[PDB]
Design a protein around this ligand. Sequence first.
Ligand SMILES: O=S1(=O)NC(Cc2cccc(C(F)(F)F)c2)=Nc2ccccc21
Length: 442
Amino acid sequence: RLPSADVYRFAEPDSEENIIFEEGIPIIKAGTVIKLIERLTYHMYADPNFVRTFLTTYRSFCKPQELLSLIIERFEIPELKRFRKEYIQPVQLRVLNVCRHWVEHHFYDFERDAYLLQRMEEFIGTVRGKAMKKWVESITKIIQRKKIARDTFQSSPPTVEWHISRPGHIETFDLLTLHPIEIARQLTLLESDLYRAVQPSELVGSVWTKEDKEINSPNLLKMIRHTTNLTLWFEKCIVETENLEERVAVVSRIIEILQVFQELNNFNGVLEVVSAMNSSPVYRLDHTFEQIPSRQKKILEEAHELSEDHYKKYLAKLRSINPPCVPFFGIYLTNILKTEEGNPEVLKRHGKELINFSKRRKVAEITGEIQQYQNQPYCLRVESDIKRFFENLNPMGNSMEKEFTDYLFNKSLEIEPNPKPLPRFPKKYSYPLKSPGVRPSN
Ligand SMILES: O=S1(=O)NC(Cc2cccc(C(F)(F)F)c2)=Nc2ccccc21
């Protein structure tokens, strides 16, 4: 029935040397690249979970150019009445379905590689056939829509809040001059847009830590860099305020921003404040935290407790709230890296190497959890000048990260030296330190 090895590479029988399954549509555990492509375009049934997971994770084991060459060759299949009807036509329609999902959900590969797109359009444009016309036409319209695209409140959003800095006075914008409510809202819109922009393939096979990270993971990198710039800027605001009374005002203002992040269910923001508060230069400031009111200390402790016991309280709090929210991104990076490190790239059976597909699938299920929260818009107005201020945060300046964190700790040792005495430092703020609070204006 199926073709011989001398004419087709996709029709060798299944064995423990080329394809292994998990414990109805079977679920592939590991297999050769040829075996994966074959099951990806299996003539017996439709497999949307495998199609979706394969196109998200394939870059970890196959190059885009190689995948196109293999699916084109899988399509080219050389009793002839039933051979075309039950084997050639179903496989060719499965190949076209794979091209459709590929161009629709992963167009960035055709954007990054112009020659890849040239080959894909050449392949689709040469198909012809009877039932393939409708397939060639939907695929063509998707490539058209993607090429063109590359080239709203449900209710009244609250009034934008201002404090010392008047609107448009961008040169005075700072932690204590902007309104703490507006800082949290504007940072939540910025973080919400960053969260929503991340694609699942940016998180596969640790590509964001490899040589071509800027191309493969630009949205993920933007998200981690925002977290680093915000957390380090909060710490810099704290240790660079040498006067103790003014430093209490600064730390206390950051706690107020975290409370507005909690009202907004921006967990990403909450844990960036907790991260700055737990950092080595800030966490050891006993004289500063002694002055922080009890209610405010309790708010910071309950925020920390979300992380405790492998984020037990965070995971329970996240699944109980209603939209909108901004989930804590770091836990996904943590669980994905644990998966990448604790599972082997390949499985060996009978001296043969099989790609570990279950490893990729476990990583793809974590990215699916990410995606379930990417359609939650906030009923908040953007303030372009405040958004720009946070987008342009550069606490590190022209320094390496380690050199700047070393400086932050040394500043902490300077402002709060035991048994060395506690020096008094002059005031740096020439405006009122009192917060306008976190209650909106009705
Ligand atoms: O006391 S916690 O539960 N809360 C925090 C967050 C936090 C950081 C800095 C100061 C404070 C404050 F309560 F004094 F304001 C709280 N970090 C911890 C780190 C390790 C163990 C226990 C905790």
